[PDB]
A paper describes a structure:
Static data were also collected from the soluble protein tubulin that was soaked with a series of small molecule drugs. In two commissioning beamtimes at the SwissFEL Alvra endstation, we validated the general performance of the multi-reservoir extruder and determined 13 structures overall.
For this part, we determined 7 crystal structures: apo structures for both TD1 and T2R-TTL, T2R-TTL complexed with four ligands known to bind to different tubulin sides, and TD1 complexed with the photochemical affinity switch SBTubA4.
Numbering used by the authors:
A (entry chain B): 1 to 42, 45 to 276, 282 to 360, 369 to 438
B (entry chain A): 1 to 439
C (entry chain C): 1 to 440
D (entry chain D): 1 to 42, 45 to 275, 286 to 360, 369 to 441
Write the structure that this text describes.
């Protein structure tokens, strides 16, 4: 039945993961106790994708919670919808990964991984027809970055043919915890380029800018950034959670969105950025393609679009939707590749998210994403040229050779992206 | 008495299939529970409708049909639909996960495991037959199942039912109607693999049916339901010779005798008229000459192309309703000297004509107005080569960069099968150039 | 979990220890008999303050601390003082004869008589821990016990706890206060011995604290009691992240990642603001903008050096009290344009900010005015090598004539140990030069 | 717990020794009966440094009186505070020493050293934690000079890691007793250079002049000189006896006062003989040195200064800094921050405020030169050597003492001229 197992690891992974469940639980009418209280059968028709049905018309998120420190775990368990999560699926250690990729991937994480796999394996046995896994995590810490990528490799070893889908938060000096985030992120991008089928790049720098420059918020918190992440996550999974003309799953999504295997990093976008005045469909499509609405700091105009998928939610003129999309394309055809015919697809969905009359969600595969990796790479080299802070890693058993490899593999990625920009 | 078994593969064939059998039932007076008061011989009989329906001791008529899809979501709607009780449960074969728009996955990976089961279900139906004439295969070009599993099925059918005829109803892909980017790949891949296992194939271009629904029916955003009701009108016109008493196209081999003089060029063009909106309370019904004259307007063809800059190898006019031979000769006389009808020089410039006095039936609550006379024209024109040229060009654009190939190679296909199929298509276009053009 | 054991070694460490614990109690509402009425969990709990206090069945909260000195007179005051009922006798360990300002006597002759006993008491404390995080070691550079015994204790701790983290609060000698002639020797000696065993050291220059107590607090001749009360405020700001929970609070091990670029460069420079008197605080109300700016004034630094003549490798602002991010950011932007904050080219130019909501406390009868908001800046700057240079020159002046070296050799040391220690200091100074040079 | 074992030997030894107990008993509130009659708790805190605690809050000096002749200790037990002294700790001979170093070190004094040893041992077993010993004697000749240095050498073999501290009174002809005093001094300096950790050079030459010129005494007596000696001894031992902001013992003083092992001879000073500025100034003046040496003819290696009485810590710090800057030339550069200053609350008897001076100065070589001059004058002509050879010595032993004292003066010069970079 196209069931998806959700895994959320680390502090960021659990806070955005936790908001995701709060939002989609709402859209499906599930209350914090897991009892259906909605008004439409549409809310229950794909409910088996993300929720496992317990006896007593009870719905339980098919979600696994992972962390090396017990804090955020307790934070979620007492948050709004904390009770809705299955207690057996809170796997957490005590030591913490100290924002150290090596601790999460090799030393501290290794002691806990098998515990997580037993829950993963448990939730999968409970699936008529497992579709794939999805993982929320940050790339610049330790548990999400390192243990996350470690789980993604262990899961691909036991489930070599399921789909691996991650929402990956990229680090930025504007919202920074420690200086070693380029190290943690470069080691992880390496893993992602090899063991995931689809990755949504959610760039904290972009999030910061959207809050600061557009929403007019001098002092943005992680709570403001996550509001945008959950909006986007809800929109990207619409076709998975609600009925529509579109009889598609994550594999069909990857076959059409990923023309070459290593280029599976997606630029997400959302409109309107969070209103009394209603938006117009021309306005929704106008913003969706605007650089200022991309959740990844890359100017789409600096590169070309390989594949585009847009999802409109709301009760709207499907004809006008279609007219406006062909306008943009015919208005920006110099930013789409001519060698992939008809590479901009649109899905409409009648259920609008709570709070908005209608919205659009943008999923782009664009060569401009290289700017993001170039940025990560510039900040990596500045430190690595002098081997600053390496001792936090070499003291956990890692060697410099492994940093050299990740950096090299990342530059290749940037090269691949730029090879298809001059087609 | 000879029987015909229909096979519906993938989402497009299953739904198009649903629509046709709904129409076949209304046309022969068969109830949604398989009862037929028209039929006086209970449990048997050698009537013309017995080519598509078998009967039981309880007086129930069952389509000689099999529905196969690699995921249950579309067939389930048939299992709980209005004609749920009309189908035996074993006629409906569903899988666990689909082919993900991947020809390789449908033909090689998932296909290998479900092919034998399907062939058994087909055998079960062939056994009940006393003179099977062959099969009608309904499928899309673009689906991973419609493209990939079909071509494996067509390969096997040629083995287990050698002498028999295989006819194909295919849905050519168009971006105006839900298409994936890799559909050009699946189309060439399945056309090459199946090109020698199909005696005659009727293409329907979703672009064409789409515009017809917009122009003639005033539907702003046609849905699959709108499209399939118009398609199954064309299909019903093509198969009626098999289901009703008559003399023209009485068995699948006459389609190839009348329409296919060269084997590889087995792609006839269907035009159809009149398509009239049921929302038009009044609309004078056209004459025979008028509906005949419309068969030569590009607007009414199942594939957008210009037959004026091509040559004909065979035309076949099939009228349904109030049509006298006298009026047919009159129109044909006129349409010869009015329009541009080039025939290839090694073919007689003529028209095989058929008339079925029972007029088109309309699904109640459908989009189509009832008409006292309608015609369907099957012509074999080099013009249709346009649809191959458009498709092959899109193939070229992606394959030059190798885009999306890794998904196919990953299911076990060899990258070289791309080049083989394309090289075959490059020959198919040439076969049309040599047949048609001159210096 | 995350529990810290605090070891106070010798007079300076013991007397700094009293100040700190008196203050912690006042910060958490713990009484001198160890009762904490606000604590509802009797006999245990996993609260933030529990990283420094254990609990007994009777609701007593006992510091996770050991006091060690090779003579009793300074601990005897703790034993008979106001917080006498706070510590168990087994936590207070003294010998009969001290090290006589002789490193060789604290690390060998006397120290060996008592080291085993100290390590046994530490173990007992560590066994009461669910997740011992590390050790905090309070000592002076200049005393025989502060330098010699500390080095011995650090070496042994690396053997019994491996790479478990060890933090130093060190007292750097100054002539104005109360320094012996041989203190440059014990200083270079212990710095060299502990260097490979210390994850991070906070030096407090006595000359800096002394000058601050005079200028800012209007104290003609500051005493040890004057200096320690100020030192303990700095110590409290640094550990505040460990003892208090908060939405915007950052853990000290997170700063530690940004404050140690390389193992040997583990000496942050501390600054604290505001150090004002009640006479002056009655008028001025000091904003986040003012106290932040004050951290970049050379004269507010726990170590006497000139950061304008160096380069930064890390800057951490630790706020506590009535402070909100909007103001912090606004402040940092001002500083970021009016001052010479030159960073090295190989690390970002950000400022890492934590904010603790619990406001500063003052001991009753102290010299600091009660204020609504304070800040402590932990910066890693090449400028701090100036302290190494000053101390190394005094060492060289005497060692060139072997002055007083016979006292050390009489106890069992070899001249080789002196030159070895010195050459290490030499490398350490060169290490600070190189991190500052620009990349290729 | 930092007990000190006091030992006084010879006429001079017991004389200045007796006064030392008179003065420090008065300061701690101990009456001649040993009962504590003071009014401050500061007087009893470090009392155990010099006193044992007897049944019924009776405090007994921890002292041992030694002499080769009963005609002196007889006096000691008659003076005030003579009953305070524990009667077993009297260890007196009979024959006498006859101002003959050899009789005190080799022949007569040896017959009696075992007897004193048992007393020093018994007093040591009593100590919670022994600091070391302090000896008041005289290089002038006989018991204190020759036997005293024998005791130092015998105690050293049994307490080698303890501190050996002497108050040594140097001979001067202005207060002379015998002609052979130069001979005895040199034989002792030869011992002290090798077997003590710190020695205070109380010089009868300086004491004579202070009484005469300064205190304008025409006919100075030993009483008058000793009164100086007492005032100094009370001073140099202040932070041993009271709980000042200084936390130190004999070994910590040695470590900071003695840069090289042989150069452990100190120049005491005392003022007055009244503000912080003058008190500091007199203290670095030659007229206040209890040693006939001009601080300005050599350089200070290390200096310690203790101020007693009620005064402002800050002024003390400022005045001590000004003296150094205005006399920078007279301090070696290679010992940074080589002047240390303590302050004690309680003053001495009869003074609003006093200051004591302990200098380790190369100018002390003048003292040694003086003795060397008088020695080499007698030895050159071989005068009186039979007194010594008659006891068993040979000229060799006289030469070593001279050649060793020459070097001692030679070292003090070497470092005076030593430079820094
Ligand atoms: N006319 C018509 N075209 C359809 C219909 N359903 C799908 N199509 C077209 O067929 C193509 C997609 O093929 P599908 O039938 O969806 O695919 P499938 O056979 O299920 O294959 P997989 O889903 O990949 O396993 C597109 O070009 C669609 O526009 C339908 O009911 N009618
Ligand atoms: N800030 C501060 N410095 C102190 C304190 N006590 C001593 N110091 C300094 O520490 C140095 C001397 O070290 P101490 O702690 O006295 O010596 P110790 O560790 O007891 O060593 P020994 O007694 O020689 O065995 C000097 O530089 C003093 O100024 C104190 O309470 N506060
Ligand atoms: C499960 O949700 C989705 C699944 C898919 C698609 C998609 O984008 C609208 C989805 O929503 C995010 C999709 C998109 C991209 C394509 O290429 C641009 C394509 O041809 C193909 C598609 C989809 N097919 C169509 C005709 O829209 C199938 C895969
Ligand atoms: C037992 O009493 C004393 C003990 C000491 C000292 C001293 O002189 C002030 C004493 O009083 C006589 C002392 C002296 C000299 C020093 O400087 C050369 C020094 O650094 C060291 C000191 C003392 N240290 C300090 C900081 O004064 C410790 C040893
Ligand atoms: N958008 C967002 N980023 C976060 C959040 N929490 C942490 N981050 C970022 O993630 C990185 C730190 O990873 P974190 O999740 O704290 O570490 P982990 O627990 O070891 O995985 C930094 O770049 C932070 O800015 C959050 O709630 N939202
Ligand atoms: N200041 C002082 N010097 C003394 C005293 N008695 C003797 N001397 C000096 O000590 C030297 C003689 O030593 P003395 O103690 O009399 O002889 P001993 O008993 O055989 O050691 C001479 O230089 C005397 O001037 C005394 O009471 N006070
Ligand atoms: Ca019948
Ligand atoms: Ca508690
Ligand atoms: Mg974090
Ligand atoms: Mg399908
Ligand atoms: Mg001490
Ligand atoms: Mg005499």
């Amino acid at each position: 039945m196209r069931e998806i197992v959700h895994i959320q690891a680390g502090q960021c992974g659990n806070q955005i993961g936790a908001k995701f469940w709060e939002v989609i639980s709402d859209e499906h009418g599930i209350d914090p106790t897991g009892s259906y209280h909605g008004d439409s059968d549409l809310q229950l028709e794909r409910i088996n994708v993300y929720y496992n049905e317990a006896t007593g018309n009870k719905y339980v998120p098919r979600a696994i919670l992972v962390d090396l420190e017990p804090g955020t775990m307790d934070s979620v368990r007492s948050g709004p919808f904390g009770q809705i999560f299955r207690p057996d699926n809170f796997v957490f250690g005590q030591s913490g990964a100290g924002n150290n990729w090596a601790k999460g991937h090799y030393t501290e994480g290794a002691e806990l991984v098998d515990s997580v796999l037993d829950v993963v394996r448990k939730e999968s046995e409970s699936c008529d027809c497992l579709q794939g896994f999805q993982l929320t995590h940050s790339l610049g810490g330790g548990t999400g970055s390192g243990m996350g990528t470690l789980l993604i490799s262990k899961i691909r070893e036991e489930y070599p043919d399921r789909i691996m889908n991650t929402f990956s938060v990229m680090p930025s000096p504007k919202v920074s915890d420690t200086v070693v985030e380029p190290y943690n992120a470069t080691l992880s991008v390496h893993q992602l380029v090899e063991n995931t089928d689809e990755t949504y790049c959610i760039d904290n720098e972009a999030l910061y800018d959207i809050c600061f420059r557009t929403l007019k918020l001098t002092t943005p918190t992680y709570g403001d950034l996550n509001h945008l992440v959950s909006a986007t996550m809800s929109g990207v999974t619409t076709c998975l959670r609600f009925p529509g003309q579109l009889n598609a799953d994550l594999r069909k999504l990857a076959v059409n969105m990923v023309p070459f295997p290593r280029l599976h990093f997606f630029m997400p976008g959302f409109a309107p950025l969070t209103q009394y005045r209603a938006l117009t469909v021309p306005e929704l499509t106008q913003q969706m393609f605007d650089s200022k609405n991309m959740m990844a700091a890359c100017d789409p105009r600096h590169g070309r679009y390989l594949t585009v998928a847009a999802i409109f939610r709301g009760r709207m003129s499907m004809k006008e939707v279609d007219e406006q999309m062909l306008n943009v394309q015919n208005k920006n055809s110099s930013y789409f590749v001519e060698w992939i015919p008809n590479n901009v697809k649109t899905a409409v969905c009648d259920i609008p998210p709570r709070g908005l009359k209608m919205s659009a969600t943008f999923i782009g595969n664009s060569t401009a994403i290289q700017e993001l990796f170039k940025r990560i790479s510039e900040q990596f080299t500045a430190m690595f040229r002098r081997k600053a802070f390496l001792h936090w890693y070499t003291g956990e058993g890692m060697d410099e050779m492994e940093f050299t490899e990740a950096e090299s593999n990342m530059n290749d990625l940037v090269s691949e992206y730029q090879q298809y920009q001059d087609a | 008495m000879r029987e015909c078994i229909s096979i519906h593969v993938g989402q497009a064939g299953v739904q198009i299939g649903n629509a046709c059998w709904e129409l076949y039932c209304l046309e022969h007076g068969i109830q949604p529970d398989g009862q037929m008061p028209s039929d006086k011989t209970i449990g048997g009989g050698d009537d013309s409708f017995n080519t598509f329906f078998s009967e039981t001791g309880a007086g129930k008529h069952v389509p000689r049909a099999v529905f196969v899809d690699l995921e249950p979501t579309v067939i389930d709607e048939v299992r709980t639909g209005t004609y749920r009780q009309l189908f035996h449960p074993e006629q409906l074969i569903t899988g666990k996960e689909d082919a993900a728009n991947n020809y390789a996955r449908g033909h090689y990976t998932i296909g290998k495991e479900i092919i034998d089961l399907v062939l058994d279900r087909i055998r079960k139906l062939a056994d009940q037959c006393t003179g099977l004439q062959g099969f009608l295969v309904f499928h899309s070009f673009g689906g991973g199942t419609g493209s990939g599993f079909t071509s494996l099925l067509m390969e096997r059918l040629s083995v287990d039912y050698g002498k028999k005829s295989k006819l194909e109803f295919s849905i050519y892909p168009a971006p105006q109607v839900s298409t994936a980017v890799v559909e050009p790949y699946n189309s060439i891949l399945t056309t090459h693999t199946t090109l020698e296992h199909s005696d005659c194939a009727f293409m329907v271009d979703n672009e064409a049916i789409y515009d017809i629904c917009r122009r003639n029916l005033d539907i702003e955003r046609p849905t699959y339901t709108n499209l399939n009701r118009l398609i199954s009108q064309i299909v019903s016109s093509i198969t009626a010779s098999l289901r009703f008493d008559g003399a023209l196209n009485v068995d699948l081999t006459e389609f190839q005798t009348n329409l296919v003089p060269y084997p590889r060029i087995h792609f006839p063009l269907a035009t159809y008229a009149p398509v009239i909106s049921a929302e038009k309370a009044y609309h004078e019904q056209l004459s025979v000459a008028e509906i005949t004259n419309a068969c030569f307007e590009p607007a009414n063809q199942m594939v957008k192309c210009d037959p004026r800059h091509g040559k004909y190898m065979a035309c076949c006019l099939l009228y349904r309703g109030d049509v006298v031979p006298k009026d047919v000769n009159a129109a044909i006389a006129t349409i010869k000297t009015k329009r541009s009808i080039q025939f290839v020089d090694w073919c007689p410039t003529g028209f095989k004509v058929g008339i079925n006095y029972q007029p088109p039936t309309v699904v109640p609550g459908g989009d189509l107005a009832k008409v006292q006379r309608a015609v369907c024209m099957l012509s074999n024109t080099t013009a249709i080569a346009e649809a191959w040229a458009r498709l092959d060009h899109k193939f070229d654009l992606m394959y030059a960069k190798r885009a999306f190939v890794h998904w196919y190679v990953g299911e076990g296909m060899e990258e070289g099968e791309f080049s083989e199929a394309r090289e075959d298509m490059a020959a198919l276009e040439k076969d049309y150039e040599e047949v048609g053009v001159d210096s």
